[PDB]
Amino acid sequence: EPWQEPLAAGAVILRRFAFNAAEQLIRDINDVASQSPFRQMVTPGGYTMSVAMTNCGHLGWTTHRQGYLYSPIDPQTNKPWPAMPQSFHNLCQRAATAAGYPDFQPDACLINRYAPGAKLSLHQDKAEPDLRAPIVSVSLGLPAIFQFGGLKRNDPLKRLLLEHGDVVVWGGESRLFYHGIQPLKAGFHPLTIDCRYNLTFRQAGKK
Template sequence: MLDLFAEEEPWQEPLAPGAVVLRRFARARAGALISAIEAVAAVSPLRQMVTPGGYTMSVAMTNCGEVGWTTDRRGYLYSATDPLTRAPWPPMPAAFSALCHQAAVAAGYPDFQPDACLINRYAPGAKLSLHQDKDEPDLRAPIVSVSLGLPAVFQFGGLKRNDPLQRIMLEHGDVVVWGGPSRLFYHGILPLKAGQHPATGDCRYNLTFRQARKVE
């Protein structure tokens, strides 16, 4: 007899050359990932950073790994030290590293060696404006992005800010990987709609894995 409520298996959804959505890829490991987020945030708290233009970001952020991405009125940078605690960022949890490696392999990037993971927490109304991830010295490495909790609309465009946008609903456990021809495509998140998710309550978490240091 067909079970209409059975959990669907993960599947791949092509997005652009070099880019793919791995649907439900992280769902089975979400509990471990969320516990690891809480452990990281207990050491390096989530905070709303201020951009060089003086804008306070609506998304709360922290990092783990060898380096972390930060922004202030002076610019955008990667740093080995958390400017809030003045201590090194927490090491990348094993659950993060394992999931990222498996997702990168599934997307066709088996050599990806992330050394930074940016953790974003979206409350209702929080968004991420269209931008390129271009602060990394080696743009041959892809980006691996994991969605947990409330659904959000991901915008994925092209190499120019005004290129046509795809709008993709990302749900709990979905992973997006992009690199190669689409590595510098503009992308963002539309304002998060209010809701409740059994795993994260009234928010959404996003893990963004990057290779912030050049690997020879």
């Protein structure tokens, strides 16, 4: 079934942890996306991102003229983001628990969609005010190479092949570690067809 692969202090890959729940989540990805479509956000410096994005839950990650921000409102629809699906919340809390983060209460889910070539540059998740809360990151569909630092931009990166069902969780000592996804290679998956989805759960607000 599902196994573990430690990464760094506070960081684990829960291999295939989400494999069983994958269909229900992908279904929910569609339902979220029907309310708040995937869009390729433009960074504050004017770059269009290659990853296409949407959000569900109380707070959604968004780009804005003044920098990267969490908003209760989808500027694409000027409505609040969709409620977080029960399957999202359930899988997430299970993972955070299996990962040794017992009381994770996410208020934010970023949905990433990678088409072939799409990537996400090395970066830290530092837009969140409460650093105690872990990051839970679910991989679905096409395989990708995830790199994992690194408190500095340039200390050794681990390069991990993340497959459909894999969940990476990080936090505590590794909460601000650099990470990213290399240009997605083309392929097929039965459940996602031609792309890779990622679900990043966070506590983006304040307890």
